Amino acid sequence: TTATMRQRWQAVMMNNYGTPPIALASGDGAVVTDVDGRTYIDLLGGIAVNVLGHRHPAVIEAVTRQMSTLGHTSNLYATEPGIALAEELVALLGADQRTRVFFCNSGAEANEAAFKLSRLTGRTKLVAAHDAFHGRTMGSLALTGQPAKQTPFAPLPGDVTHVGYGDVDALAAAVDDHTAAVFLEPIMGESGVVVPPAGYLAAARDITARRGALLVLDEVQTGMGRTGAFFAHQHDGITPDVVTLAKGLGGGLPIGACLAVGPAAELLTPGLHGSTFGGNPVCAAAALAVLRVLASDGLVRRAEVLGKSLRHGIEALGHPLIDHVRGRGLLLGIALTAPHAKDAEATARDAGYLVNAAAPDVIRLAPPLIIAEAQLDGFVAALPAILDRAV
Amino acid sequence: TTATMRQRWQAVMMNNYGTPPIALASGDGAVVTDVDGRTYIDLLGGIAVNVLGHRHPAVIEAVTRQMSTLGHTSNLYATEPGIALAEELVALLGADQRTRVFFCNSGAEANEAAFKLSRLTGRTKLVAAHDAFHGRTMGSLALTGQPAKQTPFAPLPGDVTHVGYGDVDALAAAVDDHTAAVFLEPIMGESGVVVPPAGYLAAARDITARRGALLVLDEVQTGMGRTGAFFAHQHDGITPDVVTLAKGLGGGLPIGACLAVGPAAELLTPGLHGSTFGGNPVCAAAALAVLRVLASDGLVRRAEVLGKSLRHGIEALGHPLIDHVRGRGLLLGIALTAPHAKDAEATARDAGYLVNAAAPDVIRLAPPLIIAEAQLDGFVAALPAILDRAV
């Protein structure tokens, strides 16, 4: 029962998440089932992680095969899956300079690695955006632009200046010859799928290049083909110095990566960084399977097509509570005219849909890339009643 | 071939580990095979991670079953494996006060969670030991007591004082009413399996309790029954305020945990910390399987028996390069009379044994808890020739 599972959670878990309102028992594709047998269409993917949904045969087969071959070894030893995964990720980034890879376990750890690279430039000043989310460990939390989540743990690693997201002249004013790096999400996810103005990431590339700062693009949530290009920044024709990845990288298996291009790729020398589980064969095998499936099933182009039809379908409802839809591909925010997103998350759950109130007035969607068109169709048709019940 | 795998590594990986000398292809139990067909007895366990060796059927069964049931969901939803794992870990700690659990992906992240708990006490001073290792993210690196790995990333989060490990008077002098927490390994692993004097951990518990400081015991390397108790600190009959775990916790799958006891368990409130992959069903299922096998096969008590036989056998060699043997259970250090541990690591490798030069003069062993005594006996019989060749 849901109450027994919730009571067990409240007896033993730290309360840093609050208590989950539902307890899930199984999942298959984009459908999850709770402990009472109710099914839900998953439009959130565990917060953009389950790019291939649950029980994807290719991920299961890769993990099962690798566990029956060779498990964890540590990076005292070279192993095939991590090397192959690094080769594939470098090919997908497609930079015209030498690109090198560091594996870790999470998005916070990937940005901690990028934080450390920044230190090796000889500079200690960092710039990030207000409301950005880059992780919750002490270094990545310093980059995260959320004072209410940072103040309790101060002092944090320095020296970080935050600027308004998308504001070209604010960024230019904050970046100088002392700036080690600028961190940016190509779309701010956790804040409410906030899309920057047209030339903004290109401006960030030019500002950082002229001042000798690294440009670090955090693709933890925007990557893995979700926006219709493998990396969201590839829509903008720029090459950052560092890119970080996690969430969907392993199809659900914990893995993150920090890629560095050109001189940045050479900063880390032996003994200066590491992670015990980083690059382990089982999680790397899972990530390799995700990449294979994205390519063989054309899921990156499918995200662009479905995201475009989903945005138009929502906008065509003409619902007075919907101000606009934003995002790209299958990362979408439904921006509301009044702050009812939390209520709409609950009434959507009543209607059998899992969504996210990312902000008081924004519903975030990040469905599996394997989502059925009819599963999206049903959500759009149900949305007016979801919103009417919310208000 | 090994040469081809090393070339592929050098073309794509960042150089933070150097280039591994061995490329592994497969593993089974405590025997691994490299890409050239050479076999090795694994006395290091991927750095204390592979508590059950490779291809353990209980871990394979748990992971395959859980992947075919429910993968990642995020902590927006309650799921059974993480709740059950938290229940089992709390039972194993055996504290008399309420204990709560936070899951994450690594030992660094576990200590980052403990660092953040320390901040919520309203104090910002931290104490750790010289030569301690607590992780490489910015917060855990501040606690790590290794200047050459810290100074390139300065400034690190404050305010940490390091004291000599095992020195009661130095610790008493460093801990005052502004000290948020003391972090200690019960045996320093990375440093060279440095065992503290009798009574030290009990003194640390008394010092911290009197001064209002948290005692955080880092059991990432000493836990999972390796020393003959589930937590190494249980040998000394103390209960810390916070315990961190990782490495062997998942039998190879990436998972870590921060356990907090009594008032420390209530410091984290909703919204103040999190990790996307934390507590996910697949890794938690793996860890549950490890705990089941430890219990069903009596591997904790077995680690004590094998560690004593191993220690006695090494001491009985009377080899002039061996100064003493230290450690507990299956975390063992061979302290040498001259700094030839790196050479001995290589000659052990020539003889088909994987060991670790943890310091210039210490060979560290952390074999799978399923290692056969016969495999240990064979290493002892080979050690005189290994050490002769080393010098």
Numbering used by the authors:
A (entry chain A), B (entry chain B): 7 to 397
From the paper:
The first crystal structure of the ArgD holoenzyme from *M. tuberculosis* obtained ([Fig fig3]) showed that the protomer has three domains: the smaller N-terminal segment (residues 7 to 74), the relatively larger C-terminal domain (residues 286 to 396), and the central PLP-binding domain (residues 85 to 273), which is also the largest and has a Rossmann-like overall fold ([Fig fig3]). The prosthetic group PLP is covalently linked to Lys253 via an aldimine linkage. While NMR608 was the only hit validated by all techniques the fragment library contained a compound with similar structure (NMR868) that had only a melting shift of 0.9 C and therefore wasn’t selected initially for further testing. However, soaking of this fragment revealed that it binds in almost the same position as NMR608 ([Fig fig3]). Nevertheless, The orientation of the acid group is slightly different in NMR868 and it no longer interacts directly with arg142. For ArgD selectivity might be more difficult to achieve since many of the active site residues are conserved in comparison with the human cytoplasmic and mitochondrial enzymes.
